[PDB]
């Protein structure tokens, strides 16, 4: 299915981000760009989040390829899942009414995870127009935004009716 | 199978909603709206129901695309399987003699949960056309209609008959 | 295979009816209904039978689409088998000279259960042509009747033979 | 343990109730009356609930034998749950603070069933003080009691501190 | 547990009923029959019923041991259950107020069957006291009966009440 | 594979005989009888048997379909094989020469005694052997070979190279 | 369990026989004997029954031991069940009112015919009926209520 | 093992709290307060934390018996854990030096959990001796506590040191 | 795979032989002969052997069928694998150098039958003496694919 | 169970023989002769037999400690289950009337070796020449209880 | 077994090192504290190492109890394995001389393991007597130490032998 | 079982050498030196051998130990299985007439070529030869009879009747 989803250059972010789907949605971004580099695409996201890591691959293999990237939230994005929809193409970042949003993220291996969550938090500030210390605060702690609450905090562009 | 029934604009929900089937279902409508934006499609409904959250995801996803969504009820449409059910487009809304629905609606966020129930059951009042006191009323608790009832009620538009 | 049946327009009903099984036929016989909404449908059963909601569900569908639906019994049609054989298109209820017929009824609310209990009676009476209250005793008992005795009592309504 | 447990006369019924711990409960139920006739039993419930026709056999058990079971609800006591907690000897019917009760009680067995839930409404009637039309609406509805409102209903004796 | 109220002469017959739990029950009623011939037995029963040749096997050895074995109904005893019920030691046969009996009776040659169910109705017959003629008329459909109705009966001697 | 036999009408009933096996060979009987029914079908039985009632029903689709159905016996017959063997088109029941047949045969008990009567009838019909010796050999164990099975008129003709 | 019944001499053997089954029944059987010689022991049998070869070595160890061995019919004793039910001790040989018999029974095919006619001779001394009578009703399908199977010599005594 | 322990009245909570674990602390608790009411229990928890129904659960069962239980954080005391060890009788609430504690927060029933959850803001309020809007911030977020952190927080009475 | 082996006449028989291997190697070998009844098909055999009546199967529909059936034995051919060997085709039947036979073969009525019947052509595939091929199927021994060939049981070498 | 059966110094091999198998036989041995070195232990065999390698560990295991071994064939012993019936202590080897006893055997050049052992041991136990012993250790074939008592595998059968 | 060996106050830790191991090993030392808080323990340890969290858990309930913990080495101690050697009770800390020691160190938060290895390695300094920073120099690489390196470094006390 | 073996103070180590093994073996070495140092110990061996580290855990426990410890090979002892045969004590290291023995050996690579000559040592001590020889004899596929392990001054003695 998703397939034919994929001539469309829909992209479907539905579940949990690891490794595997990190590498699936980048390997079909990394397709999409190859067949069309000038015509945009449609990441659409309902995912509870997941690995920081995982995350920024996906977030990199965006801001690296030509298309413009569209993204929509569907259910929910939450964690690296909700980074990903803040991360869409300007004015291209799009939440259904009733879908959240939640910013809230989760050896040696720590110093890497830290840094990359310094990373994280300043593309956050940079996307949101929110200063990095509130950024800290809200990424570090449990909060729900309705589609209506992410607008007005910056994550999305448009509500779509 | 469904498969083929794709082809004709079919979708077919006959089990409990969970975040795969809402997945599934989302897919299948982003895709036929992908085909062809003008054109109907229908819904054919049985199901027990399920989470509020994946209920919502098909609803704003019927809501968001083109096409308009015919919804049938076929055996039984319950919880978030009503609530799609009534949230099909207007006069298309269609259940068979003997169908059921039970418009009773029984992880994260408590808080969520409590706002989403507040617009499901205001949605189910612009859609019956029903006071909001009486939708949650009988969200509440365990009732179910028959497609006369339902019908009456307001949340299906005709029933179809041989 | 049973998909090559499918082109030549026949389901086959083989197991125990559950909402699997039930879901199964129900979209076979949307999708044959869409290929071809002027032209006959096979159905072939031999089944022990099962939910009566399930049952019902199928029993909808049929009296639903357009294709008139024929219905065949091979080993056995008991149950809600027995009911869907009953409700095949009329002069087109067929049986095998030794398949035989129990129609015999025995997740879910008690008092959906006795409604629809009811109106599978109520239906059956219309088919068979008997009264409502032999049905009701019939249902209650645990009889088998021959491809004859079957055919006497209008469940079907011709034996296939030489 | 709950074996150490039993030769202090507590049984702890610690799930959702379906035959087999409908079995085991009865069974403990008798044994205890079988030492000692004379003296009481306690019946700690922590239970989502079950099958009408399993609650209603320790119903029956409990009314049955000489004993007198006083019931304590510790986390949970939902459906037939709530309902044993109610049949509890009077002024024995105990909750914890923080405790929960949900009354809400979900072929040709159907007759059965009807006529079983009948029993139980009026049970609850009696037992609650409640008239039967009050305990038909509450029992049909999804409704939380804290053990303050139980108390206050009938289902409990006293709130334990 | 069981192992305890072992110890208490109690065997709690609480499933259906096949060779496995057949070879059980008998097994505990040999062993509690070894320990001491003369002491009362107490058999609690809760059972769907099942298979009449692994009923007929708790039956004989019931009947042969000298111990005398009190039937005790608690949610249900159906099909070799309520026969196992009604072959308690006479006035030790017992139920509760809420209990149901359903006397219904549904790798074996086929005449195997037809004996055992004739034997059935008659040693049913002679427990009850009702001629064997209305037990075969009942046996052969579905009813349920309350404590009162099975009192009434014949098939327990005494509701457990107060 | 058999797939590839299906096209040339060739079913295999190669294993016992229960109601999904019935099913199947249900279905391939119909499906070919739907294709042409003018023309043959070659059933060809490897098979312990087993039930009547599974047995019966593909009989019962064999009579009833146009096209003549050929049986050949490969390894083995017995139970519900041998009768399906027996009911093949006449003239046209076959066995090799190594291949045995064993006519034994061993819910609604007063049913299967039906059926039981009924096919022993159809047999004593299709070998003309007396009803009365019919019931003597399926009631017990007895293996003919390939000549013992022409004699008794169970297959028409043995192939031999 | 079983165990407490071990104790009093009781054993049961209460499904299919295979070499498992035998194996424990031959080990019981041998246990007892040990214990005391003298003293009876009881077999009770309800069996769909099994295996010849499996049947056949439960058979040599009760006819070797020193303890008579009493067998009783419950449910059911069909094929080796049936054989060993006919082969308990004479005048020891049991059934309930109720129970029922039936004596219908490289690759190890020569031995297989051996063990089946010692079977078959066995079952004619021990009942009584001819051996043509024995090889006619074990090839066939038929079985027996405690009173026929009292009648054609399987058991002695129906229990009641 | 934990048997052994049991005797010296000592229980390990060393898991993610749900209902089972939560039942079997719940039964220890009970059991030892049978035992001997008037006698100390000791609390070791090493727990990620877990659901707040299955928590107060234990909570309640600590505050109805009549032994004092002193709680003795080990490696990690999350969510309820954490709320577990605050709730230990007072001046016997311990850490390890490495030890660390989270009173951070993360089916029925959304507005039950909603009432818990003003409730355990409270009670660690009490315990804490701290403002409850500052309990409402910490609860609310992520942040570990090291053992003096802990202690200065109010959340244990003192550390044991080699 | 063996699927386009197939499309060239190609049967691979690679494990032991049991009742459902038999149906899928009869139900080729019918299928083959249904495609094209002139024409060859060869049949690779490394197997362990089997059951003597699932053997006797393939055999029957190999001599029933009306195209040739050549045999070529690959690792093994033991049991029932060394007897279809020897059944193939005359001048047809292959080895390959380092290849092994043993015609070793392990209602038992029935199978003494079948066990006579293979004896029997063996002795005639071979035009070894029916009493030494007895002698040779009751014990276990290896032969060569060099003594399989000066045996009769294989008609050439494949070699070069 | 086979724990009491232990305390009566009988150990049961009823299975076929594997390292696992082996490893426990050899422990009961030990055992038994850790207890009560002076005093007899009763091995009853139903084996089908196995890996020559882990029969010989029964086998010296057997040789080497100083209880006598007496071994008893109930159902079956083939294979090493035949060979370790006939290496029990002398005038102890039993087999029960109807029980069965097949002599064939089924680093290779270890296991030559151990082939070669296991020839002798049977020549000297049974008394053949070691050439009889090898032709009947390559083929298949069972000998009754009689046959085996015969042949020297056995001292005595089991009766009366 | 083992559990004869807890006879005498022997615990074996044989294997990786998390949550179940750290649980197990924690109260086993807390069972042997409680049956003779005078009496030394021993402490077997062939381990690859583990989790730092688990590690730690372990490590306090060493220094916590009362009885001295000996710590011998017997095939690998590496990870928190070694730690746990070297934190056995002082002159008490032995070796196999074939035996191998590697102190390289590798569900959770990030800031946590960062406190916990400074932790790990300031403790590791004191034992040693190595300086801070030699420590983080060697758990940052891997090499393994023999016995009599081991020994040289600090790690051990003893190396056993004829 | 084998817990009465344990009594008796033998230790049948029967399956290959891997660290669960070692442990095992370790552990019932520590426990009967810790039950009476004095006592002699018996180690029966039918090991095709294992890993050198499992195998040198349990050499060392083996001298470190007070308890002498006999060592008996029963079907075979190869790798670490013949390494621990030929390192009981002396004098007490026994074999089966026809049990057999091989002494050919098949993470950090650095460490195992370590063991692997501190082996060759231990075994050129104790069979007395040449360490030379040792260094073919393990590098090579080999099998020696209980006379051949006899002659190598693997075993002190081989035990008959």
Same mark, same amino acid.
């Given at each position: ?8 250059? /829909?992209?479907?972010?539905? @579940?949990? +981000?690891?490794?595997?789907? =990190?590498? $699936?949605?980048?390997?079909? *971004? #990394? ?33 690296? /390829?030509?298309?413009?990237? @569209?993204? +929509?939230?569907?259910?929910? =994005?939450? $964690?690296?899942?909700?980074? *990903? #929809? ?76």
């Amino acid at each position: 299915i998703y397939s034919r989803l994929l001539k469309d250059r /829909i992209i479907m972010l539905g @579940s949990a +981000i690891d490794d595997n789907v =990190a590498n $699936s949605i980048v390997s079909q *971004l #990394l397709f999409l760009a190859a067949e069309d580099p000038e015509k945009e695409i449609s990441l659409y996201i309902n995912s509870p989040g997941g690995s920081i890591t995982a995350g920024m691959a996906i977030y990199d293999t965006m801001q690296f /390829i030509k298309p413009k990237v @569209s993204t +929509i939230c569907i259910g929910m =994005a939450a $964690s690296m899942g909700a980074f *990903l #929809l803040a991360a869409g193409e300007k004015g291209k970042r799009y939440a259904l009414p009733n879908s959240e949003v939640m910013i809230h993220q989760p050896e040696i291996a720590a110093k890497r995870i830290l840094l990359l969550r310094d990373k994280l938090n300043k593309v956050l500030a940079e996307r949101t127009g929110q200063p990095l210390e509130v950024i800290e605060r809200d990424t570090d702690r449990d909060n729900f935004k309705s589609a209506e609450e992410a607008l007005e905090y910056g994550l999305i562009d448009k509500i779509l009716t």
